[PDB]
From a paper:
One example is the fibrils formed from SAA1.1, the fibril precursor protein in systemic AA amyloidosis. The fibrils can have a length of serval micrometers and consist of cross-β structure and of β-strands that run roughly perpendicular to the fibril main axis.
These properties resemble the previously described ex vivo fibril morphology I. The helical parameters (rise 2.4 Å, twist 179.425°) of the seeded fibril are also very similar to the ex vivo fibril morphology (rise 2.41 Å, twist 179.44°). More C-terminal residues were not seen in the three-dimensional (3D) map, indicating structural disorder. The fibril protein fold of the seeded in vitro fibril corresponds to the fibril protein fold of ex vivo fibrils. The greatest similarity occurs at residues 51–64 (RMSD 0.46 Å), while the remaining part of the structures possesses an RMSD of 1.17 Å. Therefore, the greatest correspondence occurs at an inner radial position, where the two protofilaments are held together by reciprocal salt bridges between residues D59 and R61.
Author numbering:
A (entry chain H), B (entry chain J), C (entry chain L), D (entry chain F), E (entry chain D), F (entry chain B), ...: 1 to 69
Write the structure that this text describes.
Amino acid sequence: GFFSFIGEAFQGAGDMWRAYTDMKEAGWKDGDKYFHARGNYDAAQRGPGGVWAAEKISDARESFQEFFG
Amino acid sequence: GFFSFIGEAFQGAGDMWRAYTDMKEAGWKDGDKYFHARGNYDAAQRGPGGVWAAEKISDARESFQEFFG
Amino acid sequence: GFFSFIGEAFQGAGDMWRAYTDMKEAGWKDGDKYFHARGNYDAAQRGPGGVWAAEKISDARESFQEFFG
Amino acid sequence: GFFSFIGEAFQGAGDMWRAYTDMKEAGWKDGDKYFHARGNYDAAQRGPGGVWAAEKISDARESFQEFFG
Amino acid sequence: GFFSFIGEAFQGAGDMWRAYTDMKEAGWKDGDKYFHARGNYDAAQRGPGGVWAAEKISDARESFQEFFG
Amino acid sequence: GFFSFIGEAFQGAGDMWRAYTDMKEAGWKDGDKYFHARGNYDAAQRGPGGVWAAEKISDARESFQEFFG
Amino acid sequence: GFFSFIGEAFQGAGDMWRAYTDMKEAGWKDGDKYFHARGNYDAAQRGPGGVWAAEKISDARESFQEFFG
Amino acid sequence: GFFSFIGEAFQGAGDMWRAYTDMKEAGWKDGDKYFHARGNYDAAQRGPGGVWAAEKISDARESFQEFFG
Amino acid sequence: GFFSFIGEAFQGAGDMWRAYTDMKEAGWKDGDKYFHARGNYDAAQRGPGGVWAAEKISDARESFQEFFG
Amino acid sequence: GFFSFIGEAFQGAGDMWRAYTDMKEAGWKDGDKYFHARGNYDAAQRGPGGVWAAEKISDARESFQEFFG
Amino acid sequence: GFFSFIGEAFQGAGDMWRAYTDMKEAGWKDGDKYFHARGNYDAAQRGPGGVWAAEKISDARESFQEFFG
Amino acid sequence: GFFSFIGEAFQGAGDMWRAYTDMKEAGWKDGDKYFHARGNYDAAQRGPGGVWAAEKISDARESFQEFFG
């Protein structure tokens, strides 16, 4: 299939964005995650804009444009 | 299939955005997650805009535009 | 199928946005999640705009536009 | 399949962006992750713009443009 | 398949961006990761722009352009 | 398959960007990673621009251009 | 402009289907035409079907079809 | 401009299908035409079908088909 | 400009299909044409089919097909 | 410009298919044409099919096909 | 310019398919043409098929095919 | 310019397929042409197929094919 992972402007302990496929007779274990933040300024911020998730985009003409200032 | 994960401007302990597919005779275990925040300013913020989730977008013309100022 | 996950401006302990598909003879366990916040300012905020969830968008013309100021 | 991982502007303990495929008779274990931040300024920030996730983009003409200022 | 990993502007303890494929009778173990930051300024920042994830882009004409200022 | 790893502007303890393929009867172990930063200025920063991840790009004409200032 | 002349199954003396355009300070003369027919069988016949005269035909789909027997 | 002349299955004395364009200070003369037919069988006949005259045909899909028997 | 002349299955005395363009200070004369036919069988006949006159045909897909029997 | 002359299956006395272009201070004269036919069988016949006159045909895919039997 | 003359299956007295271009201070004269046919069988016949007159054909794919039987 | 003359399967008295270009202070005269045919069988015949007249054909792929039987 199509697997896509996009992530921007973020903070995490871990175990993120994974894609396990077609496994047979498997087994695993994952730990505990801790996230501690104290007294931080301006964290995990993203600017203006749009998100588009599309399986098929066909015959677009003069489309999907963005004009910032 | 089509799997898409998009995430911006966020903070988490963990175990996020995953896609397990086509598994047979499998087994797993995941931990406990802790998220602690104290006295932070301006966290996890996202700017203006739109979100579009589409399986098929066909023949768009002069569409999906954004004009910021 | 089509699986799409979009998330912005948020804070969580964990175990979010997942998509398990086509599994046979499987078993798993997930932990306990704790979220503690004390004295934070301006958290998890998102700016202006719209959300569109569509399976099929066909023949749009001069549509889906956004004008900020 | 198609696996794509894109990540920008972020801070994490670990175990991120992975893609396990076609495994048989396997087993593994992953640790615990800790993320500690105290008194940081301007962290994990991303600028303006858009995200597009597409399986197929066909016959685009004068599309997908961005104009910053 | 196609595996692509792109990452810019980030700080992590480790165990990131990996792609395990076609394994039989294997086993492994991974450690614990710690991320500690205190009193840093301007970390993990990315500038303006867009992200495009596409399996197939066909017959684009005068498309995918970016104009900064 | 096609494996591509691109990474710019970042700091990590280790164990990153790897691609294990076609292994049979193998086993390994990986350590613990520590990342400590205190009082640094301007770290892990990337400039303006776009990211494109594509399996096939066919017949592009006057496309994929970037104009900085 | 667009000038199109289509003629099928016909008999004439002459001076037909002409298109004079953009003339300045011109002059001409044309003769007399005689058409004489006596005792002919099966002349100037056209079979089944349709005529379409269009300046612009846009986005036709599964249209303009003809099924004879 | 676009000048197109199509003629099939016909009999004429002459002076047909002409296109005079952009003439200045010109002059001409044309004769007399005679058409005489006596006792002919099966003349100037055209088979089944359609005629389409179009300045622009855009984005036709599974259109303009003909099925004879 | 575009001048196209197509003619099939026909009989004429003469002076047909001509295209005079961009003439200055010119002059000419043309004769008389005679067409005489007596006792002919099966003359000037064309088979089944269609005629299309188009200035621009753009992006046709599975169109303009003909199936005879 | 583009001048194209296509003619098949026909009988004529003469002075046909000509294209005079860009003439200055010229002059000419043309004769009389005679066409006489008596007792001929099966003359000037064309088989099945289509005619297409186009200035521009762009991006046709699985189009303009003909299937005879 | 582009001048193309294609003619098949035909009988004529003369003065056909000519292209006079860029002439200055010229003059000429042409004769009379006679065409006489008596008692001929099967003359000037063309088989099945299509005619395409195009100034530009761009990016055709699996198009312009003919299948006879 | 481009001058092309193609002629097959035909019978004529003369003065055909000529291309006079770039002449200054010239003059000429041409005779009378006679075409006489009596009692001929199977003359001027052409087999199945297509005609294509194109100024530019760009990027054709698996196109312009003919399959006879």
